[PDB]
Design an enzyme around this catalytic site. Structure first.
Site, PDB file in Angstrom:
ATOM      1  N   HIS A   1       0.826  -1.203   0.000  1.00 58.94           N
ATOM      2  CA  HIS A   1       0.000   0.000   0.000  1.00 58.94           C
ATOM      3  C   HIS A   1       0.870   1.268   0.000  1.00 58.94           C
ATOM      4  O   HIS A   1       0.320   2.353  -0.114  1.00 58.94           O
ATOM      5  CB  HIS A   1      -1.049   0.003   1.142  1.00 58.94           C
ATOM      6  CG  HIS A   1      -0.498   0.203   2.520  1.00 58.94           C
ATOM      7  ND1 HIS A   1      -0.541  -0.792   3.473  1.00 58.94           N
ATOM      8  CD2 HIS A   1       0.058   1.287   3.116  1.00 58.94           C
ATOM      9  CE1 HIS A   1      -0.023  -0.322   4.608  1.00 58.94           C
ATOM     10  NE2 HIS A   1       0.358   0.940   4.398  1.00 58.94           N
TER      11      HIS A   1
ATOM     12  N   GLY B   1       2.722   5.778   9.951  1.00 63.76           N
ATOM     13  CA  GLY B   1       4.128   5.722   9.571  1.00 63.76           C
ATOM     14  C   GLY B   1       4.817   4.436  10.063  1.00 63.76           C
ATOM     15  O   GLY B   1       5.923   4.118   9.608  1.00 63.76           O
TER      16      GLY B   1
ATOM     17  N   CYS C   1       3.809   1.427   9.390  1.00 64.70           N
ATOM     18  CA  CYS C   1       3.618   0.336   8.434  1.00 64.70           C
ATOM     19  C   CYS C   1       4.951  -0.224   7.932  1.00 64.70           C
ATOM     20  O   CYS C   1       5.891   0.517   7.655  1.00 64.70           O
ATOM     21  CB  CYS C   1       2.758   0.779   7.256  1.00 64.70           C
ATOM     22  SG  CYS C   1       1.132   1.344   7.811  1.00 64.70           S
TER      23      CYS C   1
HETATM   24  C1  LIG Z   1      -6.308   3.284   6.540  1.00 66.23           C
HETATM   25  C2  LIG Z   1      -5.404   2.082   6.814  1.00 66.23           C
HETATM   26  C3  LIG Z   1      -5.400   1.015   5.776  1.00 66.23           C
HETATM   27  C4  LIG Z   1      -6.523   0.204   5.440  1.00 66.23           C
HETATM   28  C5  LIG Z   1      -6.244  -0.654   4.430  1.00 66.23           C
HETATM   29  S1  LIG Z   1      -4.585  -0.644   4.016  1.00 66.23           S
HETATM   30  C6  LIG Z   1      -4.291   0.704   5.052  1.00 66.23           C
HETATM   31  C7  LIG Z   1      -2.992   1.448   5.069  1.00 66.23           C
HETATM   32  C8  LIG Z   1      -3.244   2.760   5.802  1.00 66.23           C
HETATM   33  N1  LIG Z   1      -4.005   2.465   7.013  1.00 66.23           N
HETATM   34  C9  LIG Z   1      -3.526   2.363   8.268  1.00 66.23           C
HETATM   35  O1  LIG Z   1      -4.263   2.022   9.184  1.00 66.23           O
HETATM   36  C10 LIG Z   1      -2.052   2.682   8.520  1.00 66.23           C
HETATM   37  N2  LIG Z   1      -1.782   2.507   9.921  1.00 66.23           N
HETATM   38  N3  LIG Z   1      -1.284   1.331  10.375  1.00 66.23           N
HETATM   39  N4  LIG Z   1      -1.179   1.399  11.670  1.00 66.23           N
HETATM   40  C11 LIG Z   1      -1.616   2.635  12.085  1.00 66.23           C
HETATM   41  C12 LIG Z   1      -1.711   3.191  13.373  1.00 66.23           C
HETATM   42  C13 LIG Z   1      -2.211   4.464  13.457  1.00 66.23           C
HETATM   43  C14 LIG Z   1      -2.607   5.180  12.324  1.00 66.23           C
HETATM   44  C15 LIG Z   1      -2.547   4.648  11.062  1.00 66.23           C
HETATM   45  C16 LIG Z   1      -2.028   3.349  10.972  1.00 66.23           C
END
Ligand SMILES: C[C@H]1c2ccsc2CCN1C(=O)Cn1nnc2ccccc21
Ligand SMILES: C[C@H]1c2ccsc2CCN1C(=O)Cn1nnc2ccccc21
Lengths: 305, 305
Positions: free
Chosen positions: A41, A143, A145
């Site tokens: 992603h 951030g 991820c």
């Molecule tokens: C919208 C969602 C999503 C849903 C499907 S793929 C994806 C990538 C972006 N996303 C995230 O949740 C990213 N992310 N990961 N851990 C987090 C903790 C706090 C905030 C954001 C965070």
């Protein structure tokens, strides 16, 4: 003595973390040998996120669009492929800091350490369990991820988890290192049901053994139970069923303490039915399910890497 | 989101751990620049331990009696001195893996990460608080002596703790890196009273702010209190007195959540007087006091090193 939620030493993994930028998005990658692994992603924009067409999004990208930076050092990307929900970027340099490693898909109820990273830099390390419903209860900000979870056995790092997303309910979901989600989740911004979660019974019992070893013994009682009777109670309290395979893995702890597994089940039964009556066990006022039998023995016997 | 007991990434410290052997005793040392630091009780035998005469024991030792091994590499010892309860072994090679570092004496109520080691090899990492009574509640087995506690700020490791002993009560005691014990303890095998311990009030409040940030809000109430009234309650429940210096350090969290410090005190008051009524906060059924205000902000804002 003493008993803590202990993570693996993170050094071997810190050496593998990099930052991966595609267009405007930056997250973390894992550099092993001459391949960098990260969540696919990274190639999405805000519009893309409700239902990204990842094949079409990736087609618009070339090797030179993936900026990979390891500390100050820029890596040269010479190939890219998508495997499931991960991108694999081939770079021209093998990571000199690559440890002996394996990729493993862990089972629900197993534990691992997470190295939380932002912009390719490590922030902190903590120990987690893969929930029976294939979520993890982590600590991740935007951030994070591409942060990974791992176990270490001697000199070998077994990578089992890469962080992809936070669900609307505030728990976390991600993939193995072949890009296969744990659980039913997909990498698109929709409401997604995580199944009913349960408590990991074999871990609670391992932790009760840990408490006895450390001299917390107040919950030991005069009773015993059968596997069938215990499982009736387990089901009422949304605990996983205990199987003979579980009893078998608790064997070493049973031997060490001289407390038969079913007698410890009768303790656990009484705690479930009566609560803790405002007492604590190993510093906790609830029943802890994030230590495996393997974890308890390691901590109580002091294995190094 | 999510909130975990998170340790610092341990890589910078793993590179500094060595094994130190004197006669029959092996424990851990810390190799920084061209000096190895370890607990002076490495030079004792079983007979020595009730009241060792460390000056006389050290006189019978020469440089060549201290075997220092870093992984496979043997170090050559070219000088030795005792500082307080630590031995300082000068070696002929600067550790190439030495990070930027400082030695700090921390205050009670401050937190740090511990890298538990055996035979100079890292086993695990976990986060601790220095208790108001200058003990720590760690996880240490025999052979863990010389394991260190630390904080990291950017690229700089501040070493604050070296493990020396387990008290008969099963809690842990040790020194700063100048060899000065935290608390009244001495390095001899006697019963030693640790003072009355208290709960670290400013940390509990920091953790309540953390819970609100993460959406655990059930304990917020319609009340407020004064610093004086709160301190009456604190004293009844064996909590540390809250000072204006404490209120000041909670300022940033107060700003972030919009909940005034004294309103959060009135929440804490109600929890102390009423308990948790079988509910949980951030996955805990008691009030957690091992996160500082600094810790909460770092975790909630995601600082890296
Ligand atoms: C919208 C969602 C999503 C849903 C499907 S793929 C994806 C990538 C972006 N996303 C995230 O949740 C990213 N992310 N990961 N851990 C987090 C903790 C706090 C905030 C954001 C965070
Ligand atoms: C007898 C005592 C002592 C008392 C005065 S100096 C000293 C050194 C040896 N010692 C220890 O406690 C060592 N030690 N440290 N952490 C431990 C955890 C589990 C078991 C032993 C442990």
């Amino acid at each position: 003595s003493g008993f803590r939620k202990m993570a693996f030493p993170s050094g071997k993994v810190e050496g593998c973390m990099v930052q991966v930028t595609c267009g405007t998005t930056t997250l973390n990658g894992l550099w092993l040998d001459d391949v960098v692994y990260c969540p696919r992603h990274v190639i999405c924009t805000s519009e893309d996120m409700l239902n990204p067409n990842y094949e079409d999004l990736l087609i618009r990208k070339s090797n030179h669009n993936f900026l990979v930076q390891a500390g100050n050092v820029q890596l040269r990307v010479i190939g890219h492929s998508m495997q499931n929900c991960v991108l694999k970027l081939k770079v021209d340099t093998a990571n000199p800091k690559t440890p002996k490693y394996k990729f493993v898909r862990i089972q629900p109820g197993q534990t691992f350490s997470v190295l939380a990273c932002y912009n390719g830099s490590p922030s902190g390390v903590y120990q987690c369990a893969m929930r029976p419903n294939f979520t993890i209860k982590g600590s991740f900000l935007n951030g994070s991820c591409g942060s990974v979870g791992f176990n270490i056995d001697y000199d070998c790092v077994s990578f089992c988890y890469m962080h992809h997303m936070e669900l609307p309910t505030g728990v976390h979901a991600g993939t193995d290192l072949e890009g296969n989600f744990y659980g039913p989740f997909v990498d698109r911004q929709t409401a997604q049901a995580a199944g009913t979660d349960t408590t990991i019974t074999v871990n609670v019992l391992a932790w009760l053994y840990a408490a006895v070893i450390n001299g917390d013994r107040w919950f030991l009682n005069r009773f015993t139970t059968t596997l069938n009777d215990f499982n009736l109670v387990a089901m009422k309290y949304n605990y996983e069923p205990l199987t003979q395979d579980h009893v078998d893995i608790l064997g070493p702890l049973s031997a060490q303490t001289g407390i038969a597994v079913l007698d410890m089940c009768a303790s656990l039964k009484e705690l479930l039915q009566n609560g803790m009556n405002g007492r604590t066990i190993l510093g906790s006022a609830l029943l802890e399910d994030e230590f495996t039998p393997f974890d308890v023995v390691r901590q109580c016997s002091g294995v190094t890497f």
